[PDB]
Design a protein around this ligand. Structure first.
Ligand code: F3E
Length: 154
């Protein structure tokens, strides 16, 4: 019993774009851009749509980088997050009522103000590795258990 989500990292040679979410799940943290996949929509089309809705940016080709399943204790549905990256975007990042994008130099990624799982898999993304992960959370701050492995095929 899992629900499909996407997550997109705009990762350029010296910087990455993150968004500070203003409300709802993950508010107050920097993260990639993403959300629920819709009926009749491919996962990649959903990732492209969410990048535009949340950041104002248009992406063409998205590259599969990982899959992470999240379990939140006490919540029945698992979150099956399909992670993508791109280095080629059009438009400039847009701040909205929901999201404040900002570019970060790679040595200044704000891990203390990101979801805690990012500290594990973001370094793989930065070295162009692909991965499958599973994180069991208690609330939004505590990783009870996890697994993470690099893969050749996402
Ligand atoms: N980095 C991170 N950590 C935990 C959860 C998520 C998430 C991403 C997209 C949609 C829903 C949740 N992202």
């Amino acid at each position: 019993a899992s629900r499909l989500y996407t997550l997109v990292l705009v990762l350029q040679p010296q910087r990455v774009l993150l968004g500070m979410k203003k409300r709802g799940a993950g508010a107050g943290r920097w993260n990639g851009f993403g959300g629920k996949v819709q009926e009749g929509e491919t996962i990649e089309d959903g990732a492209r749509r969410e990048l535009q809705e949340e950041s104002g940016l248009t992406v063409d080709a998205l590259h599969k980088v990982g899959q992470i399943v999240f379990e939140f204790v006490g919540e029945p549905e698992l979150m099956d997050v399909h992670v993508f990256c791109t280095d080629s975007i059009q438009g400039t990042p847009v701040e909205s009522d929901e999201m404040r994008p900002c570019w970060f130099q790679l040595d200044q990624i704000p891990f203390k103000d990101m979801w805690p799982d990012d500290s594990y898999w973001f370094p793989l993304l930065l070295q162009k590795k692909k991965f499958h992960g599973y994180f069991k959370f208690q609330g939004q701050d505590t990783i009870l258990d996890y697994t993470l492995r690099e893969v050749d095929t996402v």
